[PDB]
């Protein structure tokens, strides 16, 4: 059982998600700044949720748990970016709403037992993702550029990372078993695991290493 690729990617994801959470926790201790504290709480919670979900997949070894974790973590990563650029509640609510639709229709697309329609839900989900990325790349950038150099600089990096990593999911889904079934399950599980760690631990490392989180 431990020799199967699928199990190995799940075990690795659990380990990396666990180590990241602990590292962020260590880094977070001995930080008094009120604003910085908020970023550490959100950013530490993200990989902690994923750790639990990846652990749950191992214990049950199914992937219905990945969507549940995407459902919880995607909104939190958006809040992180929203806090960084001091976005207004209205735009935040719109982002989370679009995000809920994105995750929700994605799951519906994977549950449908009638082909052709798989792509209909994928198109709706991808459209929702595109609205979010549009808001992040064109809307948040303007607000960030009118702010402190450190904030503007870290946001652009997090922005570029988010747009590229998130855009990869629809692609992997389409070539994977939920879509056209071109790439085997173990390769897809690997692609998602790599994307998940990069989008959470990777993203969190860049954010938490920056002075942009401090109130100043």
Record the resolution, in angstroms. 2.3
Report CA dihedral (10, 40, 162, 17) to the nearest 10 degrees. -10
* DSSP character string of 69-127: HHHHHHHHHHHHHHHHTT--HHHHHHHHHHHHHHHHHHHHHHH-SSTTHHHHHHHHHHH
CATH number of the domain to which 16 belongs: 1.20.1070.10
CA angle 175, 179, 67 (to 5 degrees): 100
Instruction: Count other C-beta atoms under 10 Å from residue 6's C-beta.
Output: 19
52 in Cβ contact with 119 (< 8 Å)? no
| Structural domain range at position 107 | 1-216
Of the candidates 79, 121, 62, 129, the one whose C-alpha atom is nearest the C-alpha of residue 100 is 129
d(CA 207, CA 163): 15
**Residue whose pair of structure tokens reads 């760690």 in the numeric block:** 197
d(CA 126, CA 170): 7
d(CA 178, CA 4): 21
Q: 199 is written with which tokens?
A: 């989008």
Please count the structural domains in the chain: 1
43 in Cβ contact with 31 (< 8 Å)? no
How were these coordinates obtained? X-ray
**Residue whose pair of structure tokens reads 């988010």 in the numeric block:** 162
């Amino acid at each position: 059982i431990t020799g199967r690729p699928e199990w190995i990617w799940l075990a690795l994801g659990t380990a990396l998600m666990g180590l990241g959470t602990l590292y962020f926790l260590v880094k977070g201790m001995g930080v008094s700044d009120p604003d910085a504290k908020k970023f550490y709480a959100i950013t530490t919670l993200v990989p902690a949720i994923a750790f639990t979900m990846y652990l749950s997949m191992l214990l049950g070894y199914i992937y219905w748990a990945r969507y549940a974790s995407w459902l919880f973590t995607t909104p939190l990563l958006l809040l992180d970016l929203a806090l960084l650029v001091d976005a207004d509640q209205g735009t935040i609510l719109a982002l989370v709403g679009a995000d809920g639709i994105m995750i929700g229709t994605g799951l519906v697309g994977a549950l449908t037992k009638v082909y052709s329609y798989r792509f209909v839900w994928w198109a709706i989900s991808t459209a929702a993702m595109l609205y979010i990325l549009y808001v992040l790349f064109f809307g948040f950038t303007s607000k960030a550029e009118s702010m402190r150099p450190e904030v503007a600089s870290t946001f652009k990096v997090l922005r570029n990372v988010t747009v590229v990593l998130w855009s990869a999911y629809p692609v992997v889904w389409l070539i994977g078993s939920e879509g056209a079934g071109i790439v085997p399950l173990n390769i897809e599980t690997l692609l998602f695991m790599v994307l998940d760690v990069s989008a959470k631990v990777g993203f969190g490392l860049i954010l938490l290493r920056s002075r942009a989180i401090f109130g100043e």
